[PDB]
Amino acid sequence: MRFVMPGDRIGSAEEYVKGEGVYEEGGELFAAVAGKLIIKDRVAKVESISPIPEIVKGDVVLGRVVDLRNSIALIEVSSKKGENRGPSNRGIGILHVSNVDEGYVKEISEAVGYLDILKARVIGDNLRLSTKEEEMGVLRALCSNCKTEMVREGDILKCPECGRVEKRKISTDYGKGEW
């Protein structure tokens, strides 16, 4: 049986190297989580029965715009695609104008808007985000005027209430309730 309870001894610190789910104390390695003990290339890790997601480079991510500067969008990143558990490192991510569309985008405001909900790919430490891929972008936007949920109109967002129209980097999933 490869299953281990937290506190189960895996061996000396010198026999194996500490990996995910395992901790070092008094020269020993122990399980920190219940799950399947796995050892590969001297590395001990426990695959936990309940993994706490960690956002890393390459992950896909759901977030909300909480502040726009001039060449910068501050994104409240909250969820990591493929996992319902709240990420260990929820926080503020940064969306620079460069990574919005891989085109030319003067104001970051032409792409992203205050309180927009948005789907992105992590491309660096500290939650560095990109929306370049077609799958990425805004998923839900509210009308600047009447705060009404904008509706996708071809390749433009339009308020169905006041008729206003606004333009952003729209994700292909906009309005589908999925990401």
Binding site: L62, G63, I117, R140, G175, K176, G177
Partner: protein, 258 residues
């Protein structure tokens, strides 16, 4: 921040609603599976656990001798309270009942009181000195939507399995609380000019705009509560009235057991 997942779920629910569907395939006047399980807390004088879909609630009943209220001697007393405890939802917060908790408990209380499910005259011990007090306490276990109806179900079920603790207060022999009606509440999520009977937590992402209707065993309406910030279309209310009465009849059937 928790808002974010919920806003997206909202778009999904509305998208399916636009195509005349619910995300779990249920019909618009269809309840999730109901399971009603009596006697789950032995110490309590009466009790019931209810599972409604994945929503779970337990209701305990406690009885003890007490002062009648000066306004109405010759009358037993019923007091309903709910704890929507942090153990049920990431959003339930430790402290005194919020409005929601007060509202839920009062709607449950209203069903029982107006249907006169419990004969309070029979709970009189002494004229205007001693009378039985019935405590009904609702404890949310798992909130996956419509704690309200789950709680109404469990409360009336627990009352139905309640043993009056006579031979402990030396008031004689233990007897079953006589219950003479079966209040059932039906709550629907109203979305624009549509309704969804028995909303799930996911569906609730659209907003907290509901209508609850409660009936007795003869299909009389005994309590109603509109809740949330919206305008209720009269025509929708009319349809939802007949529907609700019907749904309550079916639920009421689940109390036969056989």
């Amino acid at each position: 921040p928790e808002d974010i997942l919920v806003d997206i779920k909202r778009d999904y629910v509305l998208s399916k609603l636009r195509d005349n569907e619910r995300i779990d395939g249920r019909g618009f006047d269809e309840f999730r599976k109901v399971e009603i399980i009596p006697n789950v807390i032995e110490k309590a004088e009466g009790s019931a656990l209810v599972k409604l879909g994945d929503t779970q609630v337990v209701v305990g009943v406690k009885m003890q001798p007490g002062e009648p209220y000066p306004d109405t001697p010759d009358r037993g007393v019923i007091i309903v309270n709910a704890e929507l405890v942090p153990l049920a939802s990431p959003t339930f917060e430790p402290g005194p009942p919020d409005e929601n908790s007060i509202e839920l408990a009062r709607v449950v209380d209203r069903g029982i009181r107006e249907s006169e499910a419990v004969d309070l005259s029979k709970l009189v011990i002494e004229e205007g000195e001693k009378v039985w007090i019935v405590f009904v306490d609702i404890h949310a276990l798992d909130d996956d939507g419509n704690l309200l109806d789950a709680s109404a179900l469990a409360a009336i079920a627990a009352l139905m399995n309640t043993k009056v603790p006579a031979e402990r207060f030396d008031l004689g022999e233990d007897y079953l609380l006589p219950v003479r009606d079966l209040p059932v509440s039906v709550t629907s999520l109203i979305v624009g000019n549509k309704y969804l009977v028995d909303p799930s937590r996911e569906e609730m992402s659209v907003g907290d705009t509901t209508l609850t209707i409660t009936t007795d065993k003869d299909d009389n309406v005994v309590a109603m509560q509109k809740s949330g910030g919206y305008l209720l279309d009269e025509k929708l209310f009319d349809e939802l009235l007949d529907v609700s009465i019907n749904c309550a009849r079916k639920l009421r059937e689940k109390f036969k057991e056989i």
